[PDB]
Each structure stands twice: as C-alpha cells, then as structure tokens.
C-alpha cells in the first residue's frame, strides 16, 4: 500500500468524519459541525471529497508518492479557484494564542519572506488591508531576531491572548517559484529522514512554509493542513489529524508543530477507539445529539469516501500499524500530565492515582507558550471544564485547586462553564466559590472582553439569527 | 358518534400520546416519559390500550353510554388485579399542595367515609401503615367541619407544601356497595345536568368520590382519572385531559376540580394546535429530543390506539366540535392572567401588552389554595422559569419583578432554574441578583430541604443509577 494510513481513514466513524475538518475549538459552541457548514455551505463534503479522491489517486499509481505543485493545485480546485495568486494581496491577523517565541524567530528567518516582500508587524486593519505601525522585514538584522521574537511575543500578549494586534501581508513576488522550491526541498529532505520523528519534522516544516507562503487567494488552511498534511501522514502508516486549533502553521516552530500534529493524530486514535468500544464520543466537551448525527448522515455526499470505507486492506497488518502509531505518540505521555488528563481521562481511579502526591503548584499549573494551543495559560481546571471532565473537576476540587485563576483570555473555570452551558460543572464551582469569603469578588471577575461568567450564561444558546421566536 | 371527543384523541400527536398518562410535573426532570416507564415497565402501553379499547367498546354499541362497575373492573384489569379490595387496607399521605380548605370540608362531609371506617389525620408512616396522632372521622361534629378544614389546611402548610404529614386510610367495609352507589348516583345525576359545566361538575364530583373510595389495591389514579374521566369528557365532545398534577382528586373540591380538568383539557388543545402548526411542543419547560421520540415510537404498542388514529369521523363537524371546546374553556381566560401567561404565552408582543399597566403587587402575586396545583404559592416568575418562558422572564425582569421571592416549597426562581438546568434563564437571574447589594444572601437561600439553588445545580443530570461512569 502506497498510503497504509488509509486503513485509519476507513476505521474513522462515518458519522464523525467532519471532525477532521471542523476545529475542535468550535464543537461545544457550534453543535459540532453545523456552524462550520453554515459559514460556507458545501465546504465539508468538498473537503472530504478532495482528501479521499486525491488519496485514491496516489494509491492507484504504481510510482512512489512525490509531492508536486499540480497535486496542490488539484487539492485547491477540489476544496472549492484552482490557480495561484500572482499580484493579489492576501493578509490576516495572528493572535498571541497562535504564536510562540521559537515560532516567531523561525518566521523572521524565512529568507523568501524578506526577498518576496512580505510584511509583518503591529498595526490595525485598514480599508484595503492592514495599516502597519512597523514591518519587521524592513531592515531586519538577522542577529537581533532572537531578542525581537521575544519582544513581538510579549507585545502580542499585551494586546490579549485571543486578540489580533499583529498582521501579516503575504508575498506578492514569485509565488509560483517559491511553491516549486518548497515542493523540491520537501521531496529531497523526506528521502534523507530515516526515523518517523525525522519524517514528521520534515512534513511539518514544509507544510508550515507552504501555509506562510499563502499561494492561494482562499482556502490555504484546508489545502495544506486538512488535506496535503494527511497524505504524508498516511504514507508513513499514521492516522489523519483531528485538530482543536489547526491555525498554528504560521507563528509556531517546526518542533512545536510535531507536537501539535501528534496531539491531532492522538485525537483520531481516541475517536476510533471510542467508536470501536461502543463508548459515546465526548472529546472537547462535545456530545453529538442524534439529530445532529442524522442531519450529517443525510448531508454526507462523497463517492471517494465511500470507496475507502469498503477498501480492501487484507494484505496489511492492522496490529503492526496500531503498535507503530502507539510508539510514535508515546512522546505525548510525560508532558503536562494533569492537563492531558483533564482532556482525555474519564476513569475515576486513574484520575485519583494521577492527582496523588501532586502539590499546589502542579494542580494550579498554567502552561506557557510553545505547547499546543489548547494548553497555553490554562490550568487543569480550565481544561476539565471545557472537556466536560466531571471526574477530573471533582478530584481537582478535592485537591483544593484554585477555581478563581484566570487564563490568558481573563477567563476563569466559571466563564467556560457558562460558555459551555454545563449546569452540573457550574453548580460544583459555585458551591465551592460561595463557601469562601471573597465569593462576590470571584463571580464579578471580568475577562478580556469585560464580560462576567454570568454575562456568558445569559447569552448561552441565544440565536445567531434575527428572530423574535 | 357515542364519544365525539374521540376526534381529539385521533388529532393527538402519536409521538406525544404518553402526555395523557405522564404527569406534567415529571417532564422536565425525567426526560418526559422515561422515568414514568422505568418505575413500572409496560405501564404506558397498558394505560393507552385500556383507554382506547374501552372507548372503542362504548362507541361499538348501539345503546347509550352508561357507567357500570363492570366497566371500572375491565379498566383496572387492562391497566395491569381486576378485582376489588374487600378487607385489604390501602393508605397514602397527602401534602398541603394537593389540598384545599373547600376540598377538606367536602372530604370530611362524605358520609361513606364515616360509616365505612376510613381514617384521616396528622401522623407518621408506621411499619404496617400510618400511625395517626388524630383521626378526624372519630366523633366528627358536622357543625365543626368548616373551622376544622381551615385548621387541617394550616397544619398541612406548617409541615411544608410538598411534605407529607397527613395520612388517609381508606374504607375497609362494603367497598362493592359504595362502588355501585357512586355509579348509580353518577348515572342518575348526569341525566339531570343540562349545560356542559353542570355535566363537568357531576363528572368531577363522581370521579372524586371513586378516587377517595380507593376500591382497588393499586392503580386507582390511572383507572379513574387517566381512563374513566376521559370517557364522559369525550361523550360531551371534549378532548381528553393532559395533567400537570392529577393527584388532586382526594382533598380538592368538585368546583376546583372542574378548573383542574379544564386546564388539563386546555393542555391537550395546546398540544394538538402546536403539532398541527408544526410548532415545537414546549409545555411545562420540556422539549423532547429526537432520541426520546424515536425510543417512544419504537416502544409504542397499542392496537386499539391504531384503530382510533385511522377512525372515520367524516359524519362529524370538527369546527362545531372546536368552537364548543373553545367556549367551554373560555372560563380559564380571566384568572391569574400573569401566571397562565407565564405558562402558555411565547409571543413577545402579547406578553408586553399583558404586563402593561400592572403594579408591583400583581407582578409579585402568589396564588392561594384552591387554584389548580401548579399555581399555589407561585409568582409569574417561578412559572416562567419552570415553563422555559424566556420572553416572559425578560418582560418580568424589565417590570422589576422580585426574583428572591420563595414559593410554598421555599424555592426561588433560581432553585427552579438550577433544577431545570436552564443556563440562559439562570444567567439572566444571576445578572439581576448580583447587581443588587444583598446578592450573597439571595444565592444562599435554602428551600424547605435546606438546599440552595447551587446544591440543585450541582445535582443536575446526576445519574439515578449506581455507576462510576
Ligand atoms: N467554513 C469554514 C471554513 C474555514 N473555517 C476556518 O478556517 C480555517 C482554515 O482556513 P482556510 O479558509 O484557509 O481553509 C479552519 O481551521 C477554520 O478555523 C471556518 O471556520 N469555517
Ligand atoms: N409508573 C408510574 C405509575 C404511576 N405514577 C404516579 O401515580 C399516579 C397515579 O396513581 P396510580 O398508581 O393509582 O395509577 C400518577 O399520576 C403518577 O404520579 C408514577 O409516577 N409512575
Ligand atoms: C487562518 N489561516 C491563516 C491559517 C489561513 C487563512 O487562509 P486564507 O483563507 O486567507 O487563504
Ligand atoms: C396518588 N393517589 C392517591 C392519587 C392514588 C394512589 O392510588 P393507589 O396506587 O394507592 O391505588
């Protein structure tokens, strides 16, 4: 098999297939996939048809898989206008939450960004694109890049974790040349890499450079991360990626992106395992209603996906394929164990064992920049609340965790409980909060938007439409 | 047609048919019907098969409908053991919430309760039945009944609205005789009654006496109120009854029971109208999930119900049938308008018109004993919260309603928001509560169980099973 990982695409539950396109950050607030589909009707099926039809295209070819700009252009056309930008300006903002100091350093060092005329710096959105107060690619002394990357990062934080102050204007000179150059470097380097980790590092390093060069007018994310990225992953015999936040392939470093991709691959493994074990899938605090599933099942239309669901992987060992991805993802195990536990662990006994002998600093630990986005500035408590992890929240409350701690968005465990509409988790926190003398001060905590937990609670489930009801 | 009201049984939406058996008080907390079915598996279908098979039995008979003890016994057998109690003791407790001063007066005046040896009074549950501190049927001076009925009622309140202090031990002498006597009185009196209101008064008066004489060892409620009661209602060309609390046919008066039955008939009219208008049915704060409906549709098994759904009422005018029930229920219109509005009204404009020119005493009005059970001791605010009436709660908040007022169970609008798990209504109340100086005092309000709103919120959706999860 040219793409042995296609086995995991087949194992992926049909009724949850949208999860490899819809960012996990949206699930709880937008009825899983519904909000993503309403923004661009037809976009889920087109993205699924694009992935499956091109993966089937590579598999049905004797020759060994080689990345090409024709491959990329076909992927863009399918996600839809098939052609590259020439002179067209493309820009976007980047919040602190989608950045890292090591990531900023690397981005400033991309020679094609300096020669291509790309711009990056602090500023404001203007009538025809960003109005830069500064552009870091103007007179950039390469010696100053480590110190400037620290400054840019602290400046992005000053504005707010989820707020956009920094803008990026892509390259407008020789996009076709850079596209071909990135492709050549990939094909040369991938052949060099011997281990799976080396391969992953090469893949993420190239996907990042493809994203940063924003070659298309639209759909760069879906093209490169939700499609392209999954092909070399499957080539390696790995599952495709289910992301919480895929929009990190600009200001994150290649090293930190390996971790981001591994966590995304782990999500797919949890999705498959839960479905196989007849367990109700609960990842990122989202429980799909039967109405949501039936609406998706009736909406689903992808012939190339149907061919993969009935594909013959009899001449392939699923056990060796399973043991290989388990070994590859084992690097995830000893990093922010309380945080990962609050996301993945549901067994009361495993949770109790994990929280044993842990101190006040470990239970209240807020992860710093560089970790995959969901962790940054968050306590295990914030993470239990967003994941619906009642067993973890109970253990944390028993461990005397501080529930008034605000994350980098100014949000407490109470703001997320209100935002997710969880009455039970909200009740547990409020029972705790009111048993302490500063109860009223804690309830009145305003986040970065000057909003209280009860302001969000008051807006929970409020229609997105102009309706009297 | 012998039972023209059968037309309304046909109009009743199949997927909501359980609503004429499951008390509206359970809906929000027990996933509509699920909790009722789990207490006695098979009990919903048996009750539906009993109603439809006997109604079909009366319709398929030339002779005019006459109540008989054979009819009653057949109904009991079908709800299941078909036979009457002889010597067997049957007892139950009655809380203040299921009583009225006028109702207590009438009950003490039932001559068959004195001669039959029934007991009623304050007390405690004992190993073999109640342990009476007093029995009002011992040396009852009929002159003292109005003053004693007031005392009994105030004593039942002292214990708590939803708490049981008063016990009733049914008749153990000549049940067969009283059953026949109640039946004869009914058949004689119904022929006397000329108007629909007179007929209703006779029906409720007799159903009450049948309930109070508890002739069966089990299922007296279902037999007499969910089955028997619906036959003369349909005979009159009226819809069957959908109740919030049917367990009022012991200590409520015949006059107050006409109102209880009219409100129950109005519920059926709202159910039918909402289904006909493709409106999602929301009565008593319960919105059925598609899983709940499909589980009920697959569980539903009643051949006699199937015959009624395809029955031919072509030789009957549905318009005259509709205009007659509208006239009959119009008595409901000018009683506790803010309360009924909080239950039934969803249109922002109608609600705003209704709350115009209303004072502080009208907006904060708590209904007294005698009204149908859902109203007693409740403000329009408590009622909006239990009904999910967001448009009414907004109007009430704008009208400066007091949200800290506790009902006869010691519960505030906040306790019901927590109990119903409504994040949005909870948020609205908390935004209000925190903007006032005594915020903390309001949140810490304990009901009759010494429980806070957040104690209930912490227990919302907690499993009823021994499960680790
Ligand atoms: N319908 C869509 C399409 C894209 N997106 C957002 O855009 C990201 C990918 O960017 P592209 O538009 O470049 O494909 C997604 O991860 C998601 O955050 C969305 O939110 N709804
Ligand atoms: N399965 C059942 C059957 C009856 N009930 C309760 O009993 C009442 C009727 O009493 P019976 O058992 O006499 O029929 C119902 O209105 C309801 O409150 C219940 O809660 N669950
Ligand atoms: C959000 N993003 C910066 C990762 C991709 C946006 O791509 P595009 O839609 O501008 O082409
Ligand atoms: C609850 N109730 C008093 C109206 C009826 C109980 O009847 P039963 O179940 O004791 O026969």
């Amino acid at each position: 098999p040219n793409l042995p990982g296609l086995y995991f695409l087949q194992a992926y539950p049909s009724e949850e297939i949208w999860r490899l396109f819809v960012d996990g950050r949206f699930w709880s607030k937008e009825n899983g996939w519904r909000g993503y589909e309403s923004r661009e009707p037809g976009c889920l099926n087109a993205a699924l048809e694009s992935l499956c039809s091109i993966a089937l295209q590579v598999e049905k070819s004797g020759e060994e898989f080689e990345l090409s700009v024709d491959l990329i252009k076909r992927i863009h056309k399918k996600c839809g206008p098939g052609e590259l930008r020439t002179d067209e300006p493309v820009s976007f903002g980047i919040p602190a939450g989608r950045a890292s100091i090591k990531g900023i350093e690397e981005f400033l060092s991309l020679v094609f960004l300096t020669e291509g005329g790309a711009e990056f710096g602090p500023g404001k959105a203007g009538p025809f694109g960003p109005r830069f107060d500064k552009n870091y690619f103007k007179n950039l002394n390469p010696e100053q890049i480590p110190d400037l990357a620290k400054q840019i990062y602290f400046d992005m934080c000053k504005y707010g974790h989820s707020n956009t102050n920094h803008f990026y204007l892509a390259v407008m000179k020789n996009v076709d040349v850079y596209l071909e150059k990135i492709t050549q470097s990939y094909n040369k380097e991938i052949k060099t890499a011997e281990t799976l980790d080396e391969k992953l590092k090469i893949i993420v390093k190239h996907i990042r450079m493809y994203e940063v060069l924003h070659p298309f007018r639209d759909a760069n994310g879906r093209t490169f991360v939700n499609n392209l990225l999954n092909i070399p992953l499957m080539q390696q015999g790995l599952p495709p990626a289910t992301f919480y936040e895929p929009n990190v392939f600009d200001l994150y470093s290649a090293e930190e992106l390996v971790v981001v991709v591994k966590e995304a691959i782990f999500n797919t493994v949890e999705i498959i395992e839960q479905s196989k074990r007849k367990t109700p899938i609960t990842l990122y605090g989202y429980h799909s209603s039967l109405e949501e599933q039936t609406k998706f099942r009736d909406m689903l239309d992808s012939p190339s996906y149907e061919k993969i669901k009935h594909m013959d992987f009899s001449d392939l060992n699923p056990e060796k394929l399973h043991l290989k991805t388990q070994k590859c993802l084992s690097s995830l195990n000893e990093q922010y164990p309380l945080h990962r536990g609050a996301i993945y662990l549901s067994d009361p006994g495993e949770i109790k064992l994990l929280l044993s002998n842990r101190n006040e600093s470990q239970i209240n630990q807020q992860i710093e920049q560089g970790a995959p986005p969901i962790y940054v500035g968050k306590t295990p408590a914030h993470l239990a609340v967003i994941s619906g992890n009642m067993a973890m929240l109970d253990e944390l409350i028993a461990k005397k965790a501080d529930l008034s701690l605000q994350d980098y968005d100014g949000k407490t465990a109470l703001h997320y409980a209100a935002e997710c509409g969880n009455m039970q988790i909200m009740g547990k926190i409020l029972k705790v909060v009111l048993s302490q003398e500063d109860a009223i001060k804690v309830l009145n905590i305003k986040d970065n938007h000057g909003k209280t937990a009860f302001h969000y609670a008051a807006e929970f489930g409020t229609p997105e439409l102009i309706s009297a009801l």
Side-chain angles (χ1 to χ4, degrees), chain A residues 28-31 285 415-423 426 453-463:
Chain A
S28 264
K29 272 174 275 192
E30 307 177 6
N31 302 95
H415 290 268
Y416 288 116
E419 261 169 81
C420 292
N422 201 137
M423 188 57 65
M426 173 81 121
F454 313 123
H455 261 77
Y456 291 112
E459 276 147 20
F460 178 75
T462 203

Side-chain angles (χ1 to χ4, degrees), chain A residues 138-156:
Chain A
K138 190 213 185 197
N139 320 297
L140 184 74
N141 182 7
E143 320 274 63
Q144 283 167 226
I145 84 110
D147 300 305
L148 181 74
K150 274 180 253 187
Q151 191 244 225
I152 295 163
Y153 190 66
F154 301 157
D155 287 333
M156 292 170 84

Side-chain angles (χ1 to χ4, degrees), chain A residues 135-252:
Chain A
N135 167 25
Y136 295 115
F137 297 113
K138 190 213 185 197
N139 320 297
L140 184 74
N141 182 7
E143 320 274 63
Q144 283 167 226
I145 84 110
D147 300 305
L148 181 74
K150 274 180 253 187
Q151 191 244 225
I152 295 163
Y153 190 66
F154 301 157
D155 287 333
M156 292 170 84
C157 294
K158 206 151 76 190
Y159 200 73
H161 201 252
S162 298
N163 294 334
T164 306
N165 199 197
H166 284 58
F167 296 85
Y168 169 60
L169 175 70
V171 139
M172 289 188 254
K173 283 190 270 163
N174 316 105
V175 350
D176 65 321
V177 180
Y178 298 132
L179 193 62
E180 182 61 8
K181 254 74 146 67
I182 299 168
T183 310
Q184 285 172 192
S185 184
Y186 172 76
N187 294 335
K188 184 202 182 285
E189 293 191 9
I190 211 78
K191 289 190 166 193
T192 277
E194 38 226 330
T195 73
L196 226 197
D197 275 345
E198 278 166 48
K199 260 133 173 174
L200 262 27
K201 178 80 176 296
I202 299 316
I203 299 149
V204 307
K205 177 197 151 155
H206 294 270
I207 292 294
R208 192 274 190 90
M209 291 190 285
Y210 278 135
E211 164 55 44
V212 153
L213 172 77
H214 230 38
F216 305 101
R217 347 217 169 107
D218 61 312
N220 283 296
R222 278 165 277 174
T223 298
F224 297 118
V225 13
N226 300 289
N227 280 248
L228 198 65
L229 174 65
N230 288 152
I231 296 117
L233 286 187
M234 284 175 171
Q235 200 197 347
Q236 293 325 129
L238 295 172
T242 303
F243 291 97
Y244 176 82
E245 174 59 292
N247 306 289
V248 288
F249 284 77
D250 311 282
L251 267 29
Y252 260 59

Side-chain angles (χ1 to χ4, degrees), chain A residues 265-277:
Chain A
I265 293 159
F266 180 88
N267 287 338
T268 297
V269 177
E270 284 275 290
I271 313 280
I272 295 159
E273 237 82 86
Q274 284 190 277
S275 91
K276 250 159 82 276
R277 300 274 150 254

Side-chain angles (χ1 to χ4, degrees), chain A residues 251-269:
Chain A
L251 267 29
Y252 260 59
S253 88
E255 217 76 79
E256 298 152 351
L257 289 163
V258 171
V259 186
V260 164
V261 175
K262 279 191 188 182
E263 172 183 57
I265 293 159
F266 180 88
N267 287 338
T268 297
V269 177

